[PDB]
Paper text:
Here we report the investigation of the role of protein flexibility in the modulation of binding kinetics and equilibrium thermodynamics of drug binding to heat shock protein 90 (HSP90). HSP90 is one of the most abundant proteins in the cytoplasm of eukaryotic cells, comprising 2–5% of cytosolic protein under non-stressed conditions. It is a ubiquitous molecular chaperone intimately involved in a variety of pathways, including cell signaling, proliferation and survival, and protein folding. The N-terminal domain of HSP90 (N-HSP90) contains the nucleotide-binding site, which has been the target site for drugs interfering with ATP binding and ATPase activity. The unbound N-HSP90 has a highly flexible lid segment comprising residues 107–14137.
For 7 of the 20 compounds, it was possible to obtain crystal structures of the complexes bound to N-HSP90 with loop-in and helical (8, 14, 16, 18, and 20) conformations of the α3-helix region (loop- and helix-binders, respectively). The main difference between the structures is the conformation of residues 104–111, which can adopt either helical or loop-in conformations. In complexes with compounds whose R1 substituent exceeds one atom (compounds 8, 14, 16, 18, and 20), these residues have the helical conformation with an adjacent hydrophobic pocket lined by the side chains of M98, L107, F138, Y139, V150, and W162. Steric clashes between the ligands and residues 105–107 would prohibit these complexes from existing in a loop-in conformation. All ligands occupy the ADP-binding site and form typical interactions, which include hydrogen bonds of the 2-hydroxyl group of the resorcinol ring with the side chain of D93 and with a water molecule that generally mediates interactions with G97. In contrast, for the helix-binding compounds, there is a large favorable entropic contribution to binding, and most of them have a binding enthalpy penalty. This switch in thermodynamic profile is thus directly related to the conformation of the α-helix3 region with compensating differences in enthalpy and entropy of about 60 kJ mol−1 between loop-in and helix-binders. Protein flexibility is another possible contributor to favorable binding entropy. As previously mentioned, the N-HSP90 crystal structures show higher B-factors for residues 103–111 in the helical conformation, suggesting greater structural flexibility of this region compared to the loop-in conformation. In the helical structures, however, the Q23-N106 interaction is not possible due to the binding site rearrangement, and this may contribute to enhanced flexibility of the helical conformation of the α-helix3 region. on can vary significantly, indicating transition state destabilization playing a role in prolongation of residence time. Helix-binders reach up to 230-fold slower association rates, when compared to loop-binders, indicating a higher transition state energy barrier for helix-binders, as depicted in the right-hand panel of Fig. 6.
Residue numbers in the entry:
A (entry chain A), B (entry chain A): 16 to 223
The structure:
């Protein structure tokens, strides 16, 4: 039921850098995850133009931010196109390899960690604030999958037995003990207003 | 052979704004066209992972910048995924409508024309420097098409009888008389270094 995969050398090295480098501007993880969600929403919106049945799994195109102080998690939910099992493995493999190489070269040349998104590896900035990331995803052409990594050079993929989401992606950030500010309403509002004010989909910040 | 289409009200209004508003920072058109080319290159690179035959129409993934002082044109060529006839009409229609609305609202609120790309309508910044834009495109699933507009509320689409390009998109900017600086080698190099230094594909500036 649970499949374990080794990250390739470059991605494993990038994840180690993100976890271990001293960098105070951690708030940029939110902008990267929202940007990825917006891109997935653009994809399903575009496909629905030639094929309206693509929206049978859900018409609403939105992003939800769900803080949970009890579980110490910040969840980013979108109703985008979602990812197939192959998409998950390819995005944690071949895509993340070319992106990492180009980004790590720039960091050595004097670039900032905040430019990560320009290299297509923005998702991995989640490890600035999270000790573990769980991704639940559902694409129209596949079953619901759960991807997870606490870094450490590996990730797991399993079919998800949880509540069906219709279509889209849910990124569950298991926050580091010293990073609970990202569970606070005013702090999340501040980051969204600063970095994601022009996203073309409604962003709802859930209250506890 | 030649089909004529009316732009919808919002896009026609955006194109008029771009042509008539006083805005000195025109150089941003290049960044938007290179960004679109990079996105199309990401698309074909991703599709080729599950299907390597997608690269039968060309393996090289690059961007070429071709100035022509005689014809007063700056051409941006890419070997990206290209666009089908439907893609051309949809990108000049439904996609450009939602993007325009969101962008024009921001401009009224105090935003800058330089943020156009965040709204998915970055291509239309070409009209800051061009009096006419011709687009030649070839997608694996369709024939070679020529799209053209001098704004004025309409665009044409025809099957292209020119030289086959294999796969990708060619954007031909017919420059305004006072915008010939964008044909100069040092000026193009300056803009690419400033705004497109981290693009993940080789950018070749052709010499005359
Ligand atoms: C195992 C590594 C993957 C990490 N995750 C979850 C992400 O990057 C990520 C992906 C999507 C997504 N759904 N469908 C789709 O095409 N994308 C996508 C979007 C932008 C770049 C690439 C993408 F695949 C999302 O909505 C939200 C995300 O945070
Ligand atoms: C009639 C209006 C269209 C204007 N043009 C030519 C562009 O926007 C434009 C489009 C592509 C392209 N090829 N394939 C594909 O998917 N794209 C694409 C990329 C980014 C956003 C949307 C896209 F369709 C390109 O390589 C270069 C471009 O300058």
């Amino acid at each position: 039921e649970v499949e374990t995969f080794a990250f390739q050398a470059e991605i494993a090295q990038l994840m180690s850098l993100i976890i271990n480098t001293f960098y105070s501007n951690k708030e940029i993880f939110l902008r990267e995850l929202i940007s990825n969600s917006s891109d997935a929403l653009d994809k399903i919106r575009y496909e629905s133009l030639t094929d309206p049945s693509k929206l049978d799994s859900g018409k609403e195109l939105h992003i939800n931010l769900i803080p949970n102080k009890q579980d110490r998690t910040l969840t980013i939910v979108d109703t985008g196109i979602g990812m197939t099992k192959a998409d998950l493995i390819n995005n944690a493999g071949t895509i993340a390899k070319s992106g990492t190489k180009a980004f790590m070269e720039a960091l050595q040349a004097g670039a900032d960690i905040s430019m990560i998104g320009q290299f297509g590896v923005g998702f991995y900035s989640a490890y600035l604030v999270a000790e573990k990331v769980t991704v639940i995803t559902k694409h129209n052409d596949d079953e619901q999958y759960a991807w997870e990594s606490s870094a450490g050079g590996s990730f797991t993929v399993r079919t998800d037995t949880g509540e069906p989401m219709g279509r889209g992606t849910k990124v569950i950030l298991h926050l580091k003990e010293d990073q609970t500010e990202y569970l606070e309403e005013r702090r999340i509002k501040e980051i969204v207003k600063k970095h994601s004010q022009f996203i073309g989909y409604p962003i709802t910040l859930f209250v506890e």
